[PDB]
């Protein structure tokens, strides 16, 4: 029984690999060789968001493209007015060991989480004028590594206990659980239409989760180390996963296989963040080497370096309107580039 | 400017609140508490699924102990959170092997090549009672010596100290009988020695 199931699973893996190899009649570079390069895409630090006194682990833009929330191990989640550098809110966390944060698309709520195994939904539009916890989401067996709002009422979170879960914030209980990863689900990214999402796990695999029926749809492999960051391509039909193997790769949902690999011989530091420009042509990736690189997603060559941090960049994110890219770092400074 | 003046007022007020909070928190001494299950961490905590923090004050220092052993996940993806702790407290139960592997992994970690570990050998009296019926050979088959407390305990301590390679750190070993409350004073002495060593390093002299 067990041997038959294992053999059939191996045969299914072989069938999937054969189909994927039969689909790969060409490559991204072999087609985009005729595309003109974007040239040296240089940009300078426009703002420096000072005020965190410890390592910054997460940053997220509001959908309005002006307010940004940053979370640091100092125990404070600060909301920045990026146009004028003014701090709007300073939220004292119930626990200092934060590993992620999120900004609701409507801007009313902010989420937080970390080694507490608990995701806290803060309310910013309280009648009393102060920021207070609305719900504390508990149930994960391991540290919560990432969290993203689908809307004000529900949030999807990934954890180190190999489970991604969809929470109903109104009641505070899991609506749907996503299982199938072997190791920690260290990253997550909801699609632009929020119908489905991906998760990057430490077993060197990225899975395509569909929110509604709560079942895995596709799995992607090729990385040789833990995936630290993941992000959907703006069209929603591709996603780039940045691993600790000092490389990031672009996967295609409809082709069900990798397309391009962004790596350089002088790079040995592992990726910590990945993001796309609004048009998806530039893939900005954060590195443990204190630098951040800009990759021409269609040509797979570097276009510039955002070297402005004295320590490793832990978070990065392009604005919703694409006007700027923010980078958070362990040096406690968040810099706006444009 | 417009009421943006009042927005800047609010920004400055909360910036002042953040510094004051940072100034107040700078006096705390962060310590990472590690060990095997039932190794004596909770024992010393009483004497003195998420992360558990224990805090105590001794001679005007606010020590904070983080018993992170409750995390049921891989260390290497969150152990970098504690890269700034003043020292690591490692608890070993002499009355109980994988603690050596754990200690080798934690002492030689990328983020802890410059953080000195404090090693507590708990259950001294229980070990002394155990050795009266069995010798270390069961726990250490290469041990070749007399079945005596003074020699066996020293051999175990040497086995633990052999796991460091970076010269820039020290291992402060001590032996607790689980009945003595002196552990707070021992931690104070080790922490203050570590602090003056770090100050001599920060003045370019060490």
């Amino acid at each position, epitope marked *: 029984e067990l041997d038959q199931l294992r053999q059939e699973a191996e045969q299914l893996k072989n069938q999937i690999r054969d189909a994927r190899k039969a689909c790969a009649d060409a490559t991204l570079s072999q087609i985009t060789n005729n595309i003109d390069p974007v040239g040296r895409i240089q940009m300078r630090t426009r703002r420096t968001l000072r005020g965190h006194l410890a390592k910054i682990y997460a940053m997220h833009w509001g959908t309005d493209s002006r307010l940004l929330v940053s979370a640091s191990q100092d125990g404070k989640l600060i909301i920045w007015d990026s146009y004028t550098t003014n701090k*709007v809110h300073a939220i004292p966390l119930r626990s200092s060991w934060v590993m992620t944060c999120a900004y609701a698309p409507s801007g009313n709520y902010v989420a937080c989480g970390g080694l507490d195994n608990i995701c806290s939904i803060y309310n910013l539009k309280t009648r009393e*004028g*102060n920021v207070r916890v609305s719900r504390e989401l508990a149930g994960h067996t391991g540290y919560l590594s990432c969290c993203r709002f689908l809307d004000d009422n529900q949030i999807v979170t990934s954890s180190g206990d190999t489970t991604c879960a969809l929470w109903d914030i109104e009641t505070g209980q899991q609506t749907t659980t996503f299982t199938g990863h072997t190791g920690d689900v260290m990253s997550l990214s909801l699609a632009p239409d929020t119908r489905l999402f991906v998760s990057g796990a430490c077993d060197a695999s990225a899975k395509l989760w569909d929110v509604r029926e709560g079942m895995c749809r596709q799995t992607f492999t090729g990385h040789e180390s833990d995936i630290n960051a993941i992000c959907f391509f703006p069209n929603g039909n591709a996603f780039a996963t940045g691993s600790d193997d000092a490389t990031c790769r672009l996967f295609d949902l409809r082709a069900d296989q990798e397309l391009m690999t962004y790596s350089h011989d002088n790079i040995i530091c592992g990726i910590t963040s990945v993001s796309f420009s609004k048009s998806g042509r530039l893939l900005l990736a954060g590195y443990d080497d204190f630098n951040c690189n800009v990759w021409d997603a269609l040509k797979a060559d570097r276009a510039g370096v955002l070297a402005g941090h004295d320590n490793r960049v832990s978070c990065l994110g392009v604005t919703d309107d694409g006007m700027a890219v923010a980078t958070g770092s362990w040096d406690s400074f968040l810099k706006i580039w444009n | 400017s*417009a*009421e*943006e003046r009042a*927005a800047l*007022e609010r920004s400055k*007020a909360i910036e002042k609140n953040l510094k004051e909070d940072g100034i107040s928190a700078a006096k705390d001494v962060k310590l990472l508490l590690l060990g095997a299950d039932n190794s004596g961490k909770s024992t010393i905590v009483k004497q003195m699924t998420g992360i558990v923090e224990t805090h105590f004050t001794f001679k005007n220092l606010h020590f904070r102990l983080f018993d992170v052993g409750g995390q049921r996940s891989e260390r290497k993806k969150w152990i970098h959170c504690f890269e700034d702790v003043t020292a690591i407290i490692f608890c070993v139960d002499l009355s109980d092997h994988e603690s050596l592997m754990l200690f080798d992994s934690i002492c030689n970690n990328k983020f802890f090549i410059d953080t000195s570990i404090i090693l507590f050998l708990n259950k001294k009296d229980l070990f002394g009672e155990k050795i009266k019926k069995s010798p270390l050979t069961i726990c250490f088959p290469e041990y070749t010596g007399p079945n005596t407390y003074e020699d066996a305990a020293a051999y175990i301590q040497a086995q633990f100290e052999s796991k460091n390679r970076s010269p820039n750190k020290e291992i402060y070993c001590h032996m607790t009988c689980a009945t003595d409350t002196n552990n707070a004073q021992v931690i104070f002495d080790a922490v203050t020695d570590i602090i003056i060593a770090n100050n001599l390093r920060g003045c370019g002299l060490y």
Partner: single-chain antibody, 231 residues
Framework: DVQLVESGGGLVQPGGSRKLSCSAS????????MHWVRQAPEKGLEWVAY????????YYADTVKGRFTISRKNTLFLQMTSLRSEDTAMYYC??????????????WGQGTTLTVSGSDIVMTQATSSVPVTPGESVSISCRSS???????????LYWFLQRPGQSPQLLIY???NLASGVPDRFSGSGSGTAFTLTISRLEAEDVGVYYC?????????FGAGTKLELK
């Protein structure tokens, strides 16, 4: 609930002194700025004094400077000295918080009746009273001498509703944003110098007096007020 209740009204002889105290409960009083707004017995509102959070800055009206002082247990005080004959009015206690996206002047106190024995932005409302009936749509217009469209893109006209026998309530803040809890039927229009509040499918609960206020620079001059009267 959120409450602002004040005390210290009653008769006073001219030239005397009196304390008006505002008591706040149910909200983070420390983080809010607080204003005093007074209403003449048969006239419109007028701004009196402003004290910021942490008492960092204090402002007074031109006709109040030197006589009154504002101070802030979650209580606010107005020390009134050398009362004139013209200082008789109902004094409201108004909270306001300032940050990106905030809604100043959101909540107003109940007011205490108190009776006694040129470079600022003037603002005018063209029509004194507009008769209206339920179900129809009305339009109140307001204008200012100096343009309120600041360089940062915001226009700082505020609209308030005062139902008869009730304190003013914020309806539109910064001339386009609908205040929290206000029905969607209200809308703000216009830019630069002329503004307009549009009421679609008016109901009997919207009958009252409408004031337009600027917040570009102190003093915060209110409009004369347009009375929407039934039938």
């Amino acid at each position: 609930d959120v409450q602002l209740v004040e005390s210290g009204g009653g008769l006073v002889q001219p030239g005397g002194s009196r304390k008006l105290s505002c008591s706040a409960s149910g909200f983070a009083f420390s983080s809010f700025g607080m204003h005093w707004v007074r209403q003449a017995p048969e006239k419109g509102l007028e701004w009196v004094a402003y004290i910021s959070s942490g008492s960092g800055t204090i402002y007074y009206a031109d006709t109040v400077k030197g006589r009154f002082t504002i101070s802030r247990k979650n209580t606010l005080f107005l020390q009134m000295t050398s009362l004139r004959s013209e200082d008789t009015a109902m004094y409201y206690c108004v909270r306001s918080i300032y940050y990106y996206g905030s809604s100043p002047f959101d909540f107003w106190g109940q007011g205490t009746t108190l009776t006694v024995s040129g470079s600022d932005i003037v603002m005018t409302q063209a029509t004194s009273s507009v008769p209206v009936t339920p179900g129809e749509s009305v339009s109140i217009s307001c204008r200012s001498s100096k343009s309120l469209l600041h360089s940062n893109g915001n226009t700082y006209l505020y609209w308030f509703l005062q139902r008869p026998g009730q304190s003013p309530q914020l309806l539109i803040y910064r001339m386009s944003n609908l205040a929290s809890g206000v029905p969607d039927r209200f809308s703000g229009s216009g830019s630069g110098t002329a503004f307009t509040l549009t009421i679609s499918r008016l109901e009997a609960e919207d009958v009252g007096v409408y004031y337009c206020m600027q917040h570009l620079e102190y003093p915060l001059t209110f409009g004369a007020g347009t009375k929407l009267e039934l039938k």
